[PDB]
Amino acid sequence: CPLMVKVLDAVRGSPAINVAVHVFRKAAADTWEPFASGKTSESGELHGLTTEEEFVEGIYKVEIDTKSYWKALGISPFHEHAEVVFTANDSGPRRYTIAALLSPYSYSTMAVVTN
Amino acid sequence: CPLMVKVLDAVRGSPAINVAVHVFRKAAADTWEPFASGKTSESGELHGLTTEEEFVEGIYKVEIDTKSYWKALGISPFHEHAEVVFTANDSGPRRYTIAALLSPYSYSTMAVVTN
Amino acid sequence: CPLMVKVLDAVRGSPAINVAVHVFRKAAADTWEPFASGKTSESGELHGLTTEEEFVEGIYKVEIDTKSYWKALGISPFHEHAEVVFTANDSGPRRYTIAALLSPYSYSTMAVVTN
Amino acid sequence: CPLMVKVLDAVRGSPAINVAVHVFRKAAADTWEPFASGKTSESGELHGLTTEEEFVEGIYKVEIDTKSYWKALGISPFHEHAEVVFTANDSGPRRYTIAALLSPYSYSTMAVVTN
């Protein structure tokens, strides 16, 4: 599993459950193609988005739909979503964990890249 | 001044100087129009992006060009840029400060909305 | 002003107002002496804690009383306080800004050291 | 396992390996008693610090020795350590994951509390 997403809720101290995640890949003409999507689990994790075969070198965008998450909890947040844009596998195949820590007016994101 | 950006470097403990910043506004057909841009100052700040007259309600995107910043310092970073996408809402007079704290493989962003 | 503290609330998107802040300095026998304290202003800031004369090299602790802040807002928080422990070093004229971004179950802290 | 610690390095995009962690519990006379300690694994995790039986209600401090970590990498950081102080099990037995994201001049900490 080369690409995993983990989302945490800093208001409740819990995994952020059922958060929509969309992944896009930049295509040959400065257009962004849909690549994968899913919802985070009860542990705040999203696995199985892609395979090593399909996850080729390129520029990827991970969109985490934070506004819909906070609104479901009755909170009107600042951000529409959290976005993580990066080049993948430009130095060989890597495993990527994209983590996000969510608050209504702030988020932190971190990438753990392992070989 | 209704929209200010502040960028900090968590590796050097300093303002992030000469960072390119681009602001976009979502247009009537889900397309994004260039709105304002600049480079951060010696204090890590960018002021004077817009006026109260032009900064109307809408969806805005602030892109901070973090990869070029780290490459200038000799550090190999993860993200292409840091992105902050948000709705501006008239709920009384508001000033928006978008702050970002930068590390090579992580960033934190915060919005301070004051009257 | 060589030591300033800035505290922000990531739930409200605002300065954290009327937060108690305590500063300690490590003494010659691994004991911690009270050094300065105050409450953050309407801008989330605390200035005037010390002078250049008294702010000598040493180990310092900044305690931010986050639990009392969240309890005043009706939010059940995790931490008793946020703590920032650091060495001050003479390497040219330096000003220290200690910033903290607060959420109920998370905080981020940053030190900006400028000349 | 009711108390786990996870430490990440935001400069390298990796788990923070072999980081010393010390846990203290506040005792009856405003003194802090040593409770547990260890080093993070290759995954940046520290498990097995305590048992449900021994992890009683109280105020705990988790000290993460970040300065020694950065110095081993040749970096002189700002903080002596990252510190996380909290009340545990004051609402029944919980499982606590204390996570820290480390940069030379900034750190973020988050608690995931699960039942």
Q: What is the 3-state secondary structure (H, E, C) of chain D?
A: CCEEEEEEECCCCEECCCCEEEEEEECCCCCEEEEEEEECCCCCEECCCCCCCCCCCEEEEEEECHHHHHHHCCCCCCEEEEEEEEEECECECCEEEEEEEEECCEEEEEEEEEC
Using an 8 Å Cβ cutoff, are D101 and B10 in contact?
no
Q: Which residues in B lie closer than 8 A to residue D103 (C-beta atoms)? A: 10-11, 103, 106
Cβ distance of B105 and A85 shorter than 8 Å:
no
- Beta carbons within 10 angstroms of residue B50's beta carbon: 16
The response to whether C45 counts as a known ligand-binding position is yes
Give the range of the structural domain holding residue A71, as residue numbers without chain letter. 2-115
- D42: Cβ contacts below 8 Å, ≥ 6 apart: D15, D17
Cβ distance of C10 and A108 shorter than 8 Å:
no
Cβ distance of D13 and A108 shorter than 8 Å:
no
3-state secondary structure (DSSP) of residue A68 = helix
How many residues make up chain B in this entry?
A: 115
How far is CA C91 from each of CA A47, C56, D67, rounded to the nearest angstrom?
48, 12, 18
3-state secondary structure (DSSP) of residue B71 = helix
- Tokens found for residue A50: 């892609």
Question: What residues of B are designated binding site for L-thyroxine?
Answer: 6, 45, 108
Q: Which amino acid is at C50?
A: T
Among residues D108, A86, A59, the alpha carbon closest in space to that of B66 is found at A86
- Beta carbons within 10 angstroms of residue C72's beta carbon: 11
Neighbors of chain D by Cβ distance (3+ pairs < 8 Å): A, B, C
Beta bridge partners of D21: D38, D64
What are the percentages of helix, strand and coil residues in chain A, rounded to 5? 5, 55, 40
Give the nearest partner residue to B83 out of A85, A105, A112, using CB atoms: A85
Cβ distance of B13 and D101 shorter than 8 Å:
no
Using an 8 Å Cβ cutoff, are B67 and B103 in contact?
no
Q: Which amino acid is at A38?
A: G
Domains: count for chain A: 1
* Residue pairs spanning A and B at CB distance below 8 A: 50
Cα separation, C59 vs C50, in Å, equals 15
Neighbors of chain C by Cβ distance (3+ pairs < 8 Å): A, B, D
Identify each DSSP E strand in chain B by its residue range.
3-9, 14-15, 20-26, 32-39, 45-46, 58-64, 79-88, 95-103, 106-114
Among residues B83, C7, C73, D3, the alpha carbon closest in space to that of A82 is found at B83
* Residue pairs spanning A and C at CB distance below 8 A: 36
Among residues D64, D69, D98, the alpha carbon closest in space to that of D81 is found at D64
Long-range contacts of D55-58 (CB under 8 A, 24+ apart): D55/D2, D55/D3, D55/D88, D55/D89, D55/D93, D56/D89, D57/D87, D57/D88, D57/D89, D57/D90, D58/D25, D58/D26, D58/D87, D58/D88, D58/D89
Sheet holding C79-88, edge to edge: C32-39, C20-26, C58-64, C79-88, D79-88, D58-64, D20-26, D32-39
Half-sphere exposure of D72 (CA within 13 A, CB side): 11
- Beta carbons within 10 angstroms of residue C33's beta carbon: 10
Cα separation, B85 vs B61, in Å, equals 4
The nearest CA of chain B is from the CA of D86 a distance in Å of 23
Counting beta carbons within 10 angstroms of the beta carbon of residue B79, is it exposed (0 to 12), middle (13 to 18) or buried (19 or more)?
Answer: buried
Q: Which residues in A lie closer than 8 A to residue C103 (C-beta atoms)? A: 10-11, 103, 106
Cβ distance of C15 and B112 shorter than 8 Å:
yes
Using an 8 Å Cβ cutoff, are A98 and A62 in contact?
yes
Using an 8 Å Cβ cutoff, are B8 and B101 in contact?
yes
Buried b (16+ CB within 10 A) or exposed e, A43-71: ebbbeebbeeeebeeeebbbbbbbbebbe
Chain C's closest residue to B15, CA to CA, is: C112
Using an 8 Å Cβ cutoff, are B14 and C114 in contact?
yes
Cβ distance of C106 and D107 shorter than 8 Å:
no
Query: How far, rounded to the nearest angstrom, does the alpha carbon of residue C93 sit from its chain's CA centroid?
Result: 20
Q: Does B108 touch chain A (CB under 8 A)?
A: yes
Counting beta carbons within 10 angstroms of the beta carbon of residue C101, is it exposed (0 to 12), middle (13 to 18) or buried (19 or more)?
Answer: buried
Q: Which value, to the nearest 10 degrees, does the dihedral of the CA atoms of residues D45, D47, D49, D50 take?
A: 150
Q: Does C11 touch chain A (CB under 8 A)?
A: yes
Q: What resolution in angstroms, rounded to 1 decimal?
A: 1.6
Cα separation, C91 vs C114, in Å, equals 11
Using an 8 Å Cβ cutoff, are A98 and A4 in contact?
yes
Cβ distance of C105 and A10 shorter than 8 Å:
yes
Q: Which amino acid is at A57?
A: E
Cα separation, A97 vs A46, in Å, equals 10
User: Residue C71 carries which DSSP code?
Assistant: H
User: Residue A96 carries which DSSP code?
Assistant: E
Cα separation, D37 vs D20, in Å, equals 7
Q: Which amino acid is at A31?
A: T
Cα separation, B90 vs B86, in Å, equals 13
Q: Does D106 touch chain A (CB under 8 A)?
A: no
Most C CBs within 10 Å, among A103, A109, A110, to test the C interface: A103
How far is CA D70 from each of CA A111, B105, D78, rounded to the nearest angstrom?
19, 16, 10
The nearest CA of chain C is from the CA of D83 a distance in Å of 6
The nearest CA of chain C is from the CA of D101 a distance in Å of 9
